[PDB]
Amino acid sequence: EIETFYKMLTQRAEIDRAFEEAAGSAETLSVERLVTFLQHQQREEEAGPALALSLIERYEPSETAKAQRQMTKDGFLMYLLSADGNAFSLAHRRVYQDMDQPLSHYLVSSSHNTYLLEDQLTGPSSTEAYIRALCKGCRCLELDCWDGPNQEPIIYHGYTFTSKILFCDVLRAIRDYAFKASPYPVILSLENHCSLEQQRVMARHLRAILGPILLDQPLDGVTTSLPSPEQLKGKILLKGKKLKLVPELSDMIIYCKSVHFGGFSSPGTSGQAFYEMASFSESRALRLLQESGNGFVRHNVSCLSRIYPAGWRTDSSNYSPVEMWNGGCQIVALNFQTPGPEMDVYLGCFQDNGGCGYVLKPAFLRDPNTTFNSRALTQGPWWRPERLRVRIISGQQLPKVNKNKNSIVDPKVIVEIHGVGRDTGSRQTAVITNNGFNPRWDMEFEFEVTVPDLALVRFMVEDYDSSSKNDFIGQSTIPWNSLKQGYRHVHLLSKNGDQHPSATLFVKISIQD
Numbered sequence: 001e002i003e004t005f006y007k008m009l010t011q012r013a014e015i016d017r018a019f020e021e022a023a024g025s026a027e028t029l030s031v032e033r034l035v036t037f038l039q040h041q042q043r044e045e046e047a048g049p050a051l052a053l054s055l056i057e058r059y060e061p062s063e064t065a066k067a068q069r070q071m072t073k074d075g076f077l078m079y080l081l082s083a084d085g086n087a088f089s090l091a092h093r094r095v096y097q098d099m100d101q102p103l104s105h106y107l108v109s110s111s112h113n114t115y116l117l118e119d120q121l122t123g124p125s126s127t128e129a130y131i132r133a134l135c136k137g138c139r140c141l142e143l144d145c146w147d148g149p150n151q152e153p154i155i156y157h158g159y160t161f162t163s164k165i166l167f168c169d170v171l172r173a174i175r176d177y178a179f180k181a182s183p184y185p186v187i188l189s190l191e192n193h194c195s196l197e198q199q200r201v202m203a204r205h206l207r208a209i210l211g212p213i214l215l216d217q218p219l220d221g222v223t224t225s226l227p228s229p230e231q232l233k234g235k236i237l238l239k240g241k242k243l244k245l246v247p248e249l250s251d252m253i254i255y256c257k258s259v260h261f262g263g264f265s266s267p268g269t270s271g272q273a274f275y276e277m278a279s280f281s282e283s284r285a286l287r288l289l290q291e292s293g294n295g296f297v298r299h300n301v302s303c304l305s306r307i308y309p310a311g312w313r314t315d316s317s318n319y320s321p322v323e324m325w326n327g328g329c330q331i332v333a334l335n336f337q338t339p340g341p342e343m344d345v346y347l348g349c350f351q352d353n354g355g356c357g358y359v360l361k362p363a364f365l366r367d368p369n370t371t372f373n374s375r376a377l378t379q380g381p382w383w384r385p386e387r388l389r390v391r392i393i394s395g396q397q398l399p400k401v402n403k404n405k406n407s408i409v410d411p412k413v414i415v416e417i418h419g420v421g422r423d424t425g426s427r428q429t430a431v432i433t434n435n436g437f438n439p440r441w442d443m444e445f446e447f448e449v450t451v452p453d454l455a456l457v458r459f460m461v462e463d464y465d466s467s468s469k470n471d472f473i474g475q476s477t478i479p480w481n482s483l484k485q486g487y488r489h490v491h492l493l494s495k496n497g498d499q500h501p502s503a504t505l506f507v508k509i510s511i512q513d
């Protein structure tokens with residue numbers, strides 16, 4: 001029975017079935033019978049004996065089967081639970097994109113009022129908040145500088161009761177973590193409310209603390225465009241007002257001068273210099289996208305636009321980033337402290353390209369002459385309908401979302417499509433009652449996605465509550481082009497972005513044009 005049990009508790013039919021079909025009669029998968037699976041099922045492009053063999057070498061537990069170039073059901077499952085079996089493309093989990101274009105061509109991971117740990121009104125500020133963001137790959141941070149006691153500038157949310165911290169303390173932390181998660185440039189957005197004296201102090205600290213990391217001179221060459229992530233690699237650039245403002249500071253603003261939004265230079269030649277960055281509240285941006293979608297887009301090709309949360313979000317809530325990315329907006333600032341679908345999608349997007357924090361925009365969003373407008377879709381390269389079929393097969397060890405008691409989860413799965421408005425959709429499965437160890441739904445959904453290049457597929461698992469609002473159990477957001485096909489496992493994350501060791505969803509994905 002001790003056999004039966006570990007052999008029972010640990011026993012997945014869907015897995016068995018999958019092995020069967022692949023292996024057929026055999027009790028094993030031969031390199032050829034693995035290749036066809038890799039091609040027919042997993043749709044690997046690099047399908048071939050080479051891959052198969054590495055899979056077997058990497059995952060096969062049986063020394064006999066290994067040595068004999070075969071895969072057992074055990075190795076089959078291990079492959080399926082590995083980084084290679086992940087629905088989130090392993091290949092995309094390393095920098096693999098063109099890092100040589102001007103900054104304006106990349107979506108950049110950006111945070112809003114980075115110093116804040118909670119609400120915008122009375123919650124605390126901390127260097128920790130900066131460390132956290134940086135550790136999540138954030139590239140563009142915010143510093144709200146105000147004069148402090150003893151000629152030491154402080155950082156906090158002006159005009160509120162949020163707790164304070166030292167500008168210098170913040171600089172050390174940024175210094176210490178700026179590149180822990182990526183080698184690409186960090187941008188510091190300074191909102192400067194300092195007296196000229198304390199501004200001088202700021203400049204002193206910047207130089208003193210950042211030293212060589214700090215970029216304080218234009219890049220030789222770099223004449224008509226913003227440098228590239230590659231060119232700025234290992235650097236930290238300041239973004240702010242450039243000559244009420246001491247030269248010491250103004251002189252350090254090189255590639256990102258804060259400017260008031262002029263408008264878009266289509267009816268002319270020039271508008272904002274590539275080294276000029278405009279900011280838009282969530283609200284204004286929406287409006288501009290609503291009326292000037294293509295203008296904004298075209299603007300965003302050579303120019304970096306920063307977007308920030310609406311003033312009413314004193315709770316540090318977040319808006320949807322997708323809507324801004326659809327306009328090619330690059331520095332879409334969110335409140336990194338706040339868990340929710342928005343940050344889920346945010347970090348899902350940025351888990352791409354090895355999480356270096358810079359993700360190359362689609363080509364049509366890099367064409368100054370594009371006619372694209374996610375709002376008014378016409379024919380163009382962006383238009384490329386695909387049919388996605390996702391089968392939510394089963395769940396493994398869904399985490400017990402507290403309950404402050406001994407209950408059993410009643411899980412259900414929601415699958416969502418995020419992208420151009422036309423494509424957004426959501427579907428949900430039934431609820432399996434009292435089972436988190438191995439609920440089985442075996443439900444399939446199909447979605448039509450017309451602009452996959454801007455889409456993300458999100459899997460969310462909730463604990464169905466009849467009386468209350470359903471608890472969130474886990475989630476995973478995968479950018480369209482990183483979505484792997486065939487049988488895969490979706491590795492669920494907690495609301496804080498943390499990896500849930502053994503919580504997975506087993507699915508079968510198929511994308512067809």
Ligand SMILES: O=P1(O)C[C@@H]2[C@H](O)[C@@H](O)[C@H](O)[C@@H](O)[C@@H]2O1
Pocket residue numbers: 112113144157158191279308
């Ligand atoms: O704490 P904040 O200054 C950060 C945020 C923006 O990024 C600024 O562009 C804007 O002007 C402020 O109103 C907003 O509150």
Ligand SMILES: [Ca+2]
Pocket residue numbers: 113142143144191
């Ligand atoms: Ca601010």
Ligand SMILES: [Ca+2]
Pocket residue numbers: 407408409410433434
């Ligand atoms: Ca229950």
Ligand SMILES: [Ca+2]
Pocket residue numbers: 409410463464465466
């Ligand atoms: Ca429930």
